[PDB]
Ligand binder design. Sequence first.
Ligand SMILES: [Co+2]
Length: 263
Amino acid sequence: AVVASLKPVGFIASAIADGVTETEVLLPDGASEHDYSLRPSDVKRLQNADLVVWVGPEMEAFMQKPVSKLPGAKQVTIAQLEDVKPLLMKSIDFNMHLWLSPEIARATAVAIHGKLVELMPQSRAKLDANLKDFEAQLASTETQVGNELAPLKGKGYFVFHDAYGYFEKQFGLTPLGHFTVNPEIQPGAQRLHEIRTQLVEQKATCVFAEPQFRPAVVESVARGTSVRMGTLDPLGTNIKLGKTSYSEFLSQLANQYASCLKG
Ligand SMILES: [Co+2]
């Protein structure tokens, strides 16, 4: 099996490995990439994996130590791939939400493919086909997502999690910035004043919460203002692993944006 750190990383892995081997994801649905510790049993899961795919030490802090017990030959460490490094964005220290970049997703898929071919040369033909099928899917999706978000150019929005920079830049979306907010408690008066001022001064169209946010949080932020409330899921909790899962994840995100922004 290929073991991926986070679910969308698993979506990319499962496209290349479909019909050759299994793909498992380490981070459970609902968990945060920034606040997690691996299970006691994951140690054996990593040792048995054919391949471990992760972003890198600036993203999955929960994997630094366990990954040092693995040869670099077993790893696809996306942030440190030669073709990924020139693609890294700041951030105004790079933004490490790489699985949201169709071009880094392609570089990731090439790396996975290269390595599975070495380990399973008998499955070369299937692996080659899976890479070709992944490219075809992703290019159709890029076209669809591009068409979807183009009429939304110029509509400014804020988000509560700075995870979307690679996606936004490729598809011409107008983010205004992000806010650092507690997902669990209602914002107090100060934080509400600072946010709502920006919402009004910058004439925001939307604020986007995330699934792990209890509804009353964003509702409190939006109260009074004419700003609409949306939801984005950067980890595609909703979507099941499989051949078409990465393309599905990107389309769902574009729909989430459009569902609030169209208007
Ligand atoms: Co994040």
